[PDB]
Amino acid sequence: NGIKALDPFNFYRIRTFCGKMLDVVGQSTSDNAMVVQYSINNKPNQNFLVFTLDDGYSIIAAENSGKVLDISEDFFFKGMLIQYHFANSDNQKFLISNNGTIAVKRSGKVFDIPGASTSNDAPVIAYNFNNAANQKFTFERVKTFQVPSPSIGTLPPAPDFKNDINEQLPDKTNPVITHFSTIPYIMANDATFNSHQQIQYSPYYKLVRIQYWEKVTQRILGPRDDYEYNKTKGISKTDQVSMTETVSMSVGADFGFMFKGFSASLSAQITKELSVTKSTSTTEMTEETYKEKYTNPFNYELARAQYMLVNEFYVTRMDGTRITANWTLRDNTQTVTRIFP
Amino acid sequence: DNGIKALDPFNFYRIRTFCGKMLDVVGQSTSDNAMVVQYSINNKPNQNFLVFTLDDGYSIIAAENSGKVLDISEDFFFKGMLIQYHFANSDNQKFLISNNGTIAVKRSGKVFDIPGASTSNDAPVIAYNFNNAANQKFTFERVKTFQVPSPSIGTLPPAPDFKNDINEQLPDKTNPVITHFSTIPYIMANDATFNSHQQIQYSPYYKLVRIQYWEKVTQRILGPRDDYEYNKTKGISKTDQVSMTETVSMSVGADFGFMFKGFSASLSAQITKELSVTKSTSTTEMTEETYKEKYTNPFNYELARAQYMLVNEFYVTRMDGTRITANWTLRDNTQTVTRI
Amino acid sequence: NGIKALDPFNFYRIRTFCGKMLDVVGQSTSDNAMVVQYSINNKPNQNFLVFTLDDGYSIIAAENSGKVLDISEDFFFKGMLIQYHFANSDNQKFLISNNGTIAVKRSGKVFDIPGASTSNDAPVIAYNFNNAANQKFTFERVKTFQVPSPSIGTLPPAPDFKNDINEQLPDKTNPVITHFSTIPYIMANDATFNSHQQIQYSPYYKLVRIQYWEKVTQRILGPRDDYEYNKTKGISKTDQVSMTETVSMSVGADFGFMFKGFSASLSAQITKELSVTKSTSTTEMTEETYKEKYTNPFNYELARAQYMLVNEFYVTRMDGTRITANWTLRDNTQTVTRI
Amino acid sequence: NGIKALDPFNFYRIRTFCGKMLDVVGQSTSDNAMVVQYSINNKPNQNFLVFTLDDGYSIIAAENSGKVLDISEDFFFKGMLIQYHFANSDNQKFLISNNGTIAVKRSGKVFDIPGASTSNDAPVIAYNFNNAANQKFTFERVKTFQVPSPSIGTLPPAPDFKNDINEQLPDKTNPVITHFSTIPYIMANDATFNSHQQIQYSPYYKLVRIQYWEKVTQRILGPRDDYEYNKTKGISKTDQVSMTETVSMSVGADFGFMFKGFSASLSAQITKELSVTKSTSTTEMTEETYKEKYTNPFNYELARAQYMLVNEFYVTRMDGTRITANWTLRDNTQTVTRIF
Ligand SMILES: [N+]
Ligand SMILES: [N+]
Ligand SMILES: [N+]
Ligand SMILES: [N+]
User: Where are its TM segments located (chain A) (predicted)?
Assistant: First the structure.
């Protein structure tokens, strides 16, 4: 037996050995954080989302709030299952297996119904694995939702001269959405939605990548004339801060992404989905504008235009509402030079 | 509904739930936390309890397995759960045991409840609104019985008197006699050499004992018109005041009444009754002071004058009689006898 | 909260609050009539047909036999859900609503899984509606079948003389199927199929109406000649008995249909589908043959032909197999006379 | 394993595998005869009496109605467990075993919770034994009652003359209660108590035997003097019919009891408790009165007195209330003759 695979866009019902379902409210526990197995209610308190991370451990989020399942390390109530806001803690990371066991990352203990209770307010306490039926759970599909996909297009080539030395080439190519990454609400910080609102309306947020060619300079100069032009590379501090505040990410000096806090758990997925490299750099990149000088090497009058690859990254809600401005990263490494024949 | 259920103080009781299981402060899956759950009969101290009934009619339920008592959590995350916690004079630890079978929390009025009427071995207890369901009813069973030794009691003798010998030296103090004692639960008394667990094991009840005797302030023989000044002392020492408060959270007020602090207040009525002492109405605490008094003989014939002052000594012992504190001495200035 | 609509030609699976299905056999109930909540087995004992009547209430029939869901009125087992043959009784009539509730017609009580049992042999007991999850059920399409439709033709006009040749006109026009009605097997009494066989092979029966003109008389006579000819109206007793025996219907004296017993439940539907009138007559119609006399009013040789509208009604199985002879009704009211 | 033994005078609670109890009313089944699994109520709906018969099979009676557990033979509800008025039917007779299984006498299948339902209002259906947990049940003592026992005395000897030929001996000895038999209410036909009333107030009825000597004749005779006197033996028709109507018993011609209907199931107990013989006679006894003649063979003047053993049988409720007249049986076989 191995890791259980669950579709991400389904709300799930967690069925216990006796046919009752985990409920984050309960009857006698209505006024506290306890999670108990209760009779089927067909209510959001019994609906969950399972977010599987790179390490194979998953985050289980209740629909009733934005909060997730948590195993208390409290001295007085050690081992209890409660509902607590996401804090990227090992007691909140669970391993769902085909055998039916939900295993805590922090401790090898698994979900267990104390005394194999069949009662409606029976709590869940972490217990050493013993292969008893009361330790086994089944996930049922409750309802399904869809995440719209943005239209995707490939990057066009940098514009080129067409037999006219005095033609002005476009300042930039039409921006195209080349990639996007689908991440859970727990990762994205939305100023205008609280955690509960998020899971209700935007369970997954989308991080979208647009690529286009930006014209650094175009000038016509004499056979043996030189000129100096400004060129800009990198990403602004404001974009760096905003990226970190929203998704706990920044861009490293090596043009790789730096994953901080919660984001690190999905580093592999995000890099793969955006076609970007994980940073190996200690320091974060800054926007730099510097002067570069070009001299005409040919004796005939010559026209030169240079394009730089530019990336814009932004986060949207599931529906597509954009919650942040585009974060601009200029890659000086990827550049195309155009001249008149 | 029917009324307060009365339980003998010197019995350990087993609390039986609706399904025939017993409340257990350890549990199986809860062994590593403070949760109290109904479990199958094991006849072990984790299922044994001792009941302390206070003046207000509410009782404290103390486990035998530890010195801790039953408590209802007010934590945001685990509100209403029943756990074992060190005793504090808080209403969530005070419960009303009634003939109808309900254990009611003082703070909230809610009663002990087995969630979902679970018959399971680790079913927890949660305070829940009274609905007269079977799962809210509990029965107390006698498990074991113990006896508290009582100190021998004698009346205060009369102050010593002269027997036709003007040169006789009267006793400096009369033989001390134990006039009163008060039986209090271990939760009230702080024992330096026994921890709470040890206390419930070995001295569930402590004894607060009152000794009374006459102490001779002065004796003198003088001529028709002779003057002298002698020391006289009244009150209770600062050290005794601190020790009394430290040990049983009590002190003596300036009006010769006792001041009850913290836990002690819960049994004030019992203690005052058992010791035959008055509750203080004074804000300030009494202090021992020594002052000089001057006497002149009013008669032309030679006479001898001796004065005795009534002295109280209060001390705390363990159930077996082991003394854990020095006698706390209170000098009653108003109660004095003069002999000629 | 309104009435739920289900396609008639689908077999349905009744899904309970816990994802288990109603099963008319069960494990511990295999030897009795009880219907219980059971895990999916993909067998006909979990397959049902829903027959919606004129009153909006529906009949639920299990595929395993011809029998339908029934709520016991037994003193000892009152309120239990069992499988029992159709008897057109209110305890067998159920109201399916969008809220998910199946409501008994006789009482206000609805289907309920006692104690919200998740067990494989949990019974079903009628209980007062409380909006609990254990009272809500979902119908899922399992498999579907098609009911053939007969070729439909309009009534031709009665034939007329051509060129005054005084030729012999057709005795009857080519019969055409003007109408047909699709009804469930529970309404039809089939001698050669038992109830179990019916639901297996002919879930719905078809009642077909054919109309054509019948020549009552044709004769050529001289000026002012009179003659008496026989004319026949109505429906035969044998057809009346066979119609009642097969579909519990008869034809009333007012040329309307009389719906008796089970048939009444679909009276409106049937009348609408056949374009026929519900009878207001106390007595049933009989076939009558009587003489009618004509005198030529015109001072010349004249040819007269009269046609009467004739209806033939018959019942077939879903595949089209005809189980009864045509029932003939001659409509005296609708007649055409030509010269 | 073997037959489980239960004390007869206890009300019992039948516990299912999940800790819930059999309830003869239920919630959704409140309006029908079904017996279902339900949570503990501490109510008579869940209280039963177990009547163990001679064959080892037992009858379980509900306190809430007086009706007994019955396994339906209905075509539509075959195998369902309901409460039904008592009849001497094998489906109502169950075998309680140490393993926890309740087996129907009529059909081998035992009590089973369908689908191992842990829910309330879960039915009980007879199912083939498979040793599953849902087939095992445990009996808990709920409450206990006592059946008063009448004072028992031995039969005194028939009276004898005391040196006076003119002395008149007593017509009968003071009657004494030699035996009684404790029988369940289902056996006894009580006009004034219905089944519900019976199980509430007289779960067991008592059949009591009184014995005494009755003087058939007394006379003093001279030499060779003879006379004819009436003698009566047997039991009256009215007593026979009343005995049959009340406890379905009668007395056979061989002075043994004939057990009819349910009574036969308890034959061994009753015969033992009353010290009476089970009848082997085809026909029932009738009361007969006939003349018997005695001749004095001796020339002494002699007084002759003859006593016949007389039995009185009657039925009382548990408290002792008598519901029927004494049934009089005169045994001519046991007779004593006295001479002077
Ligand atoms: N509520
Ligand atoms: N243990
Ligand atoms: N089945
Ligand atoms: N009940």
Answer: none
